[PDB]
Scaffold this motif. Structure first.
Motif, PDB file in Angstrom:
ATOM      1  N   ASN A 113     -10.937 -11.087  -1.304  1.00  0.00           N
ATOM      2  CA  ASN A 113     -11.051  -9.651  -1.572  1.00  0.00           C
ATOM      3  C   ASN A 113      -9.694  -8.951  -1.524  1.00  0.00           C
ATOM      4  OD1 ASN A 113     -14.127  -9.005  -1.640  1.00  0.00           O
ATOM      5  ND2 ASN A 113     -13.890 -10.275   0.195  1.00  0.00           N
ATOM      6  N   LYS A 165       0.830  -1.214   0.000  1.00  0.00           N
ATOM      7  CA  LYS A 165       0.000   0.000   0.000  1.00  0.00           C
ATOM      8  C   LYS A 165       0.862   1.262   0.000  1.00  0.00           C
ATOM      9  CE  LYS A 165      -3.650   2.256   2.714  1.00  0.00           C
ATOM     10  NZ  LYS A 165      -4.201   2.325   4.096  1.00  0.00           N
ATOM     11  N   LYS A 188     -14.916  -6.453 -11.118  1.00  0.00           N
ATOM     12  CA  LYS A 188     -15.771  -5.439 -10.468  1.00  0.00           C
ATOM     13  C   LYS A 188     -15.307  -4.030 -10.847  1.00  0.00           C
ATOM     14  CE  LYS A 188     -14.320  -7.334  -6.629  1.00  0.00           C
ATOM     15  NZ  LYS A 188     -14.043  -7.903  -5.267  1.00  0.00           N
ATOM     16  N   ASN A 207     -12.347   8.925  -2.657  1.00  0.00           N
ATOM     17  CA  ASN A 207     -12.673   8.782  -1.242  1.00  0.00           C
ATOM     18  C   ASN A 207     -13.051  10.149  -0.656  1.00  0.00           C
ATOM     19  OD1 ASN A 207     -12.819   8.181   1.491  1.00  0.00           O
ATOM     20  ND2 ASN A 207     -10.788   7.230   1.621  1.00  0.00           N
ATOM     21  N   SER A 219     -20.109   2.679  -0.796  1.00  0.00           N
ATOM     22  CA  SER A 219     -19.434   1.454  -0.368  1.00  0.00           C
ATOM     23  C   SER A 219     -20.199   0.623   0.671  1.00  0.00           C
ATOM     24  CB  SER A 219     -18.032   1.790   0.155  1.00  0.00           C
ATOM     25  OG  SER A 219     -18.112   2.444   1.412  1.00  0.00           O
ATOM     26  N   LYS A 242     -23.862   3.534   5.276  1.00  0.00           N
ATOM     27  CA  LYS A 242     -23.377   4.908   5.113  1.00  0.00           C
ATOM     28  C   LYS A 242     -24.462   5.821   4.534  1.00  0.00           C
ATOM     29  CE  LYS A 242     -18.643   3.290   4.682  1.00  0.00           C
ATOM     30  NZ  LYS A 242     -17.511   4.182   5.055  1.00  0.00           N
ATOM     31  N   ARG A 292     -25.184   2.789  -4.673  1.00  0.00           N
ATOM     32  CA  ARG A 292     -25.999   3.025  -3.486  1.00  0.00           C
ATOM     33  C   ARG A 292     -26.249   4.530  -3.393  1.00  0.00           C
ATOM     34  NH1 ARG A 292     -21.970  -1.015  -1.783  1.00  0.00           N
ATOM     35  NH2 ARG A 292     -23.023  -2.797  -0.795  1.00  0.00           N
ATOM     36  N   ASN A 352     -17.736   7.428   0.494  1.00  0.00           N
ATOM     37  CA  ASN A 352     -17.635   8.395   1.586  1.00  0.00           C
ATOM     38  C   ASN A 352     -17.929   9.842   1.201  1.00  0.00           C
ATOM     39  OD1 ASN A 352     -16.981   6.283   3.396  1.00  0.00           O
ATOM     40  ND2 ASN A 352     -14.794   6.449   2.875  1.00  0.00           N
ATOM     41  N   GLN A 384      -7.541  -4.944  -2.270  1.00  0.00           N
ATOM     42  CA  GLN A 384      -7.696  -3.556  -1.814  1.00  0.00           C
ATOM     43  C   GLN A 384      -7.577  -2.442  -2.863  1.00  0.00           C
ATOM     44  OE1 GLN A 384      -8.659  -2.360   1.342  1.00  0.00           O
ATOM     45  NE2 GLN A 384      -9.252  -4.523   1.469  1.00  0.00           N
ATOM     46  N   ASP A 388      -9.359  -5.241  -7.359  1.00  0.00           N
ATOM     47  CA  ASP A 388     -10.581  -4.721  -6.793  1.00  0.00           C
ATOM     48  C   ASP A 388     -11.324  -3.937  -7.868  1.00  0.00           C
ATOM     49  OD1 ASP A 388     -12.172  -4.677  -4.414  1.00  0.00           O
ATOM     50  OD2 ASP A 388     -11.782  -2.498  -4.322  1.00  0.00           O
ATOM     51  N   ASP A 415     -18.377 -13.896   2.873  1.00  0.00           N
ATOM     52  CA  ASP A 415     -18.656 -13.037   1.731  1.00  0.00           C
ATOM     53  C   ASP A 415     -19.271 -13.897   0.631  1.00  0.00           C
ATOM     54  OD1 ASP A 415     -18.810 -11.235  -0.326  1.00  0.00           O
ATOM     55  OD2 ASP A 415     -16.682 -10.703  -0.350  1.00  0.00           O
ATOM     56  N   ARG A 467     -22.262  -0.149  -9.949  1.00  0.00           N
ATOM     57  CA  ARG A 467     -23.118  -0.560  -8.834  1.00  0.00           C
ATOM     58  C   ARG A 467     -23.298   0.665  -7.944  1.00  0.00           C
ATOM     59  NH1 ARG A 467     -24.547  -1.938  -3.888  1.00  0.00           N
ATOM     60  NH2 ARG A 467     -24.938  -4.111  -3.238  1.00  0.00           N
TER      61      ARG A 467
HETATM   62  O1  LIG Z   1      -7.776   1.779   5.855  1.00  0.00           O
HETATM   63  C1  LIG Z   1      -8.075   1.734   4.640  1.00  0.00           C
HETATM   64  O2  LIG Z   1      -7.269   1.355   3.760  1.00  0.00           O
HETATM   65  C2  LIG Z   1      -9.458   2.151   4.221  1.00  0.00           C
HETATM   66  O3  LIG Z   1     -10.390   1.850   5.269  1.00  0.00           O
HETATM   67  C3  LIG Z   1     -11.750   2.140   4.929  1.00  0.00           C
HETATM   68  O4  LIG Z   1     -12.501   1.282   4.050  1.00  0.00           O
HETATM   69  C4  LIG Z   1     -13.229   0.065   3.836  1.00  0.00           C
HETATM   70  C5  LIG Z   1     -12.336  -0.972   3.144  1.00  0.00           C
HETATM   71  O5  LIG Z   1     -11.066  -1.034   3.802  1.00  0.00           O
HETATM   72  C6  LIG Z   1     -12.128  -0.659   1.663  1.00  0.00           C
HETATM   73  O6  LIG Z   1     -11.443  -1.741   1.020  1.00  0.00           O
HETATM   74  C7  LIG Z   1     -13.477  -0.426   0.987  1.00  0.00           C
HETATM   75  O7  LIG Z   1     -14.304  -1.563   0.654  1.00  0.00           O
HETATM   76  C8  LIG Z   1     -15.686  -1.551   0.261  1.00  0.00           C
HETATM   77  C9  LIG Z   1     -16.468  -2.599   1.058  1.00  0.00           C
HETATM   78  O8  LIG Z   1     -16.319  -2.393   2.470  1.00  0.00           O
HETATM   79  C10 LIG Z   1     -16.010  -4.009   0.690  1.00  0.00           C
HETATM   80  O9  LIG Z   1     -16.848  -4.987   1.319  1.00  0.00           O
HETATM   81  C11 LIG Z   1     -16.072  -4.186  -0.823  1.00  0.00           C
HETATM   82  O10 LIG Z   1     -17.369  -4.050  -1.430  1.00  0.00           O
HETATM   83  C12 LIG Z   1     -18.032  -4.331  -2.676  1.00  0.00           C
HETATM   84  C13 LIG Z   1     -19.537  -4.174  -2.449  1.00  0.00           C
HETATM   85  O11 LIG Z   1     -19.845  -2.859  -1.955  1.00  0.00           O
HETATM   86  C14 LIG Z   1     -20.034  -5.230  -1.457  1.00  0.00           C
HETATM   87  O12 LIG Z   1     -21.468  -5.247  -1.406  1.00  0.00           O
HETATM   88  C15 LIG Z   1     -19.548  -6.620  -1.856  1.00  0.00           C
HETATM   89  O13 LIG Z   1     -20.069  -7.139  -3.089  1.00  0.00           O
HETATM   90  C16 LIG Z   1     -20.854  -8.346  -3.081  1.00  0.00           C
HETATM   91  C17 LIG Z   1     -19.958  -9.592  -3.177  1.00  0.00           C
HETATM   92  O14 LIG Z   1     -18.904  -9.563  -2.204  1.00  0.00           O
HETATM   93  C18 LIG Z   1     -19.337  -9.725  -4.564  1.00  0.00           C
HETATM   94  O15 LIG Z   1     -18.625 -10.964  -4.663  1.00  0.00           O
HETATM   95  C19 LIG Z   1     -20.420  -9.677  -5.636  1.00  0.00           C
HETATM   96  O16 LIG Z   1     -21.260 -10.836  -5.530  1.00  0.00           O
HETATM   97  O17 LIG Z   1     -21.197  -8.474  -5.505  1.00  0.00           O
HETATM   98  C20 LIG Z   1     -21.856  -8.284  -4.241  1.00  0.00           C
HETATM   99  C21 LIG Z   1     -22.545  -6.946  -4.233  1.00  0.00           C
HETATM  100  O18 LIG Z   1     -22.477  -6.212  -5.247  1.00  0.00           O
HETATM  101  O19 LIG Z   1     -23.150  -6.608  -3.194  1.00  0.00           O
HETATM  102  O20 LIG Z   1     -18.132  -6.658  -2.116  1.00  0.00           O
HETATM  103  C22 LIG Z   1     -17.725  -5.759  -3.155  1.00  0.00           C
HETATM  104  C23 LIG Z   1     -16.287  -6.023  -3.533  1.00  0.00           C
HETATM  105  O21 LIG Z   1     -15.624  -5.118  -4.090  1.00  0.00           O
HETATM  106  O22 LIG Z   1     -15.798  -7.154  -3.286  1.00  0.00           O
HETATM  107  O23 LIG Z   1     -15.347  -3.152  -1.502  1.00  0.00           O
HETATM  108  C24 LIG Z   1     -15.803  -1.824  -1.240  1.00  0.00           C
HETATM  109  C25 LIG Z   1     -14.972  -0.879  -2.056  1.00  0.00           C
HETATM  110  O24 LIG Z   1     -14.017  -1.352  -2.718  1.00  0.00           O
HETATM  111  O25 LIG Z   1     -15.267   0.337  -2.049  1.00  0.00           O
HETATM  112  O26 LIG Z   1     -14.158   0.644   1.651  1.00  0.00           O
HETATM  113  C26 LIG Z   1     -14.494   0.355   3.017  1.00  0.00           C
HETATM  114  C27 LIG Z   1     -15.275   1.504   3.601  1.00  0.00           C
HETATM  115  O27 LIG Z   1     -15.798   1.349   4.726  1.00  0.00           O
HETATM  116  O28 LIG Z   1     -15.382   2.566   2.943  1.00  0.00           O
HETATM  117  C28 LIG Z   1     -11.916   3.643   4.705  1.00  0.00           C
HETATM  118  O29 LIG Z   1     -13.245   3.924   4.253  1.00  0.00           O
HETATM  119  C29 LIG Z   1     -10.913   4.183   3.682  1.00  0.00           C
HETATM  120  O30 LIG Z   1     -10.912   5.614   3.772  1.00  0.00           O
HETATM  121  C30 LIG Z   1      -9.486   3.648   3.876  1.00  0.00           C
HETATM  122  O31 LIG Z   1      -8.812   4.408   4.890  1.00  0.00           O
END
Ligand SMILES: O=C(O)[C@H]1O[C@H](O[C@@H]2[C@H](O)[C@@H](O)[C@@H](O[C@@H]3[C@H](O)[C@@H](O)[C@@H](O[C@@H]4[C@H](O)[C@@H](O)[C@@H](O[C@@H]5[C@H](O)[C@@H](O)[C@@H](O)O[C@@H]5C(=O)O)O[C@@H]4C(=O)O)O[C@@H]3C(=O)O)O[C@@H]2C(=O)O)[C@H](O)[C@@H](O)[C@H]1O
Ligand SMILES: [Ca+2]
Ligand SMILES: [Ca+2]
Ligand SMILES: [Ca+2]
Length: 399
Positions: free
Chosen positions: A180, A118, A247, A189, A253, A257, A284, A230, A182, A223, A173, A282
């Motif tokens: 998954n 990272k 994806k 963001n 996300s 939220k 929200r 946010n 990153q 990813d 998941d 996708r």
């Molecule tokens: O410290 C840091 O580095 C950061 O921390 C904070 O953030 C977290 C997280 O660390 C980030 O990676 C990111 O992730 C998002 C989701 O939390 C994560 O689950 C994933 O999500 C998407 C989708 O939204 C989710 O519904 C799901 O998808 C399902 C299924 O798993 C899939 O296989 C498929 O079937 O589709 C389904 C669906 O559509 O619902 O998983 C998805 C995926 O990508 O796998 O990824 C998200 C993303 O990439 O944005 O953000 C988190 C957060 O809380 O914001 C902090 O926010 C950040 O500032 C950093 O500091």
């Protein structure tokens, strides 16, 4: 003006709202940079305090997985001394571990390893910045640009293979778990007033077809391509070419939220999505204008099989116009995926395999999303979208 100095047009999508997107167009002489490696790029970007208008021209290929002497870095360079893939796999095998969240030595070591990479691959883009590719071969490889700031333009760059050496296992998941990773190519963001235009996004030389399956699930190193999270707001993504990736674009996300409501105002137009599995986008919460995009793929592809184009997520307010989807055998209904809390979709002029469809009605959704976009350029007839987008979308199409 050249690409470095051009601004987002005053009518060109949500990015043009209020103060608009001018990036670093007003840069003084000392704030115009030409960069050809990670060191030069990082030096040009500086820190979050580097808010003067700046223009950064990318020359050639910038590999982000490199040390301070530009030597390539790989798995064993980033690996925590305590991390071992064999032992990670053995520790968290559903057969012995069950479905509880991975914890303990190997997961902690994996997390540390991930933070090591990272530090190299992820870079923040400061306020009032234009970053553009010079010529037709400007590339960012392995990199993850993050935009938390206001007023940023990114154009004419091929982003390849935002690759995570340490995918995390999540047994809950989905019904059979998932791996998954990153890194996106670009992560917005909380960023505001952003234009991403004439870029290409792909998985480079390491497509998902080169990754094995562990626990019966793809060992996923990638990813997103262009994600927004946010409270990200006032964004235009236009004339981009997304291809060969799982994806693509997740806007908002988390269902939790709720502060994203009234934000995630994003316009997607004239983008090409070829062999993209899902999330294009996708959504929200957000009022997202999706127009004149072209989608092409196969549900039977051996590498990146089509699942859905638009994700109708919780409280999403997608306004879709004259988009064209080319996926043999796909039903009108299956052009989209509807998630819990998703109840509405406006779509007009949607063409599926050359036939006019109504994706919203096919899925029993309300046709009312409570808004109409005023900030848009000319709308192509659906009949011309495929040709216009193939001809114009992506890096190396201007220069
Ligand atoms: O410290 C840091 O580095 C950061 O921390 C904070 O953030 C977290 C997280 O660390 C980030 O990676 C990111 O992730 C998002 C989701 O939390 C994560 O689950 C994933 O999500 C998407 C989708 O939204 C989710 O519904 C799901 O998808 C399902 C299924 O798993 C899939 O296989 C498929 O079937 O589709 C389904 C669906 O559509 O619902 O998983 C998805 C995926 O990508 O796998 O990824 C998200 C993303 O990439 O944005 O953000 C988190 C957060 O809380 O914001 C902090 O926010 C950040 O500032 C950093 O500091
Ligand atoms: Ca996931
Ligand atoms: Ca993700
Ligand atoms: Ca992401």
């Amino acid at each position: 003006a050249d690409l470095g100095h051009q601004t987002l047009g005053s009518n060109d999508g949500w990015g043009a709202y209020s103060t608009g997107t001018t990036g670093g167009s007003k840069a003084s002489s000392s704030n115009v940079y030409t960069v050809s490696n990670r060191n030069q790029l990082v030096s040009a970007l500086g820190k979050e305090t580097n808010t003067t208008p700046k223009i950064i021209y990318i020359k050639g290929t910038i590999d982000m997985n490199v040390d301070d002497n530009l030597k390539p870095l790989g798995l064993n360079d980033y690996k925590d001394p305590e991390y071992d893939l064999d032992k990670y796999l053995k520790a968290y095998d559903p057969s012995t571990w069950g479905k509880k969240e991975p914890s303990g030595t190997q997961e902690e070591a994996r997390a540390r390893s991930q933070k090591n990479q990272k530090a190299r691959v992820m870079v923040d883009i400061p306020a009032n910045t234009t970053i553009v590719g010079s010529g037709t071969n400007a590339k960012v490889v392995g990199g993850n640009f993050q935009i938390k700031s206001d007023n940023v333009i990114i154009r004419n760059i091929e982003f390849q293979d935002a690759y995570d050496y340490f995918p995390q296992w999540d047994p809950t998941d989905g019904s059979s778990g998932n791996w998954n990773s990153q890194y996106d190519n670009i992560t917005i963001n909380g960023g505001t007033h952003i234009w991403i235009d004439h870029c290409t996004f792909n998985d480079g030389s390491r497509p998902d077809s080169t990754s094995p399956k562990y626990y019966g699930r793809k060992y996923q190193h990638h990813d997103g391509q262009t994600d927004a999270s946010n409270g990200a707001n006032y964004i235009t993504m236009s004339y981009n070419y997304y291809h060969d990736h799982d994806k693509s674009s997740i806007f908002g996300s988390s269902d939790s939220k709720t502060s994203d409501d009234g934000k995630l105002k994003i316009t997607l137009h004239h983008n090409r999505y070829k062999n993209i599995v899902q999330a294009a986008p996708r959504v929200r919460f957000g009022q997202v204008h999706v127009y004149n995009n072209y989608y092409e793929g196969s549900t039977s592809s051996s590498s990146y099989p089509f699942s859905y184009a638009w994700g109708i997520g919780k409280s999403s307010k997608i306004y879709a116009q004259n988009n064209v989807i080319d996926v043999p055998g796909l039903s009108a209904a299956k052009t989209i995926s509807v998630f819990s809390g998703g109840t509405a979709l406006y779509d007009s002029g949607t063409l599926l395999n050359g036939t006019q469809i109504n994706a919203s009605a096919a899925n029993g959704l309300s046709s009312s999303v409570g808004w109409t976009p005023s900030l848009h350029g000319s709308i192509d007839a659906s009949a011309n979208v495929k040709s216009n987008v193939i001809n114009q979308a992506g890096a190396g199409k201007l220069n």
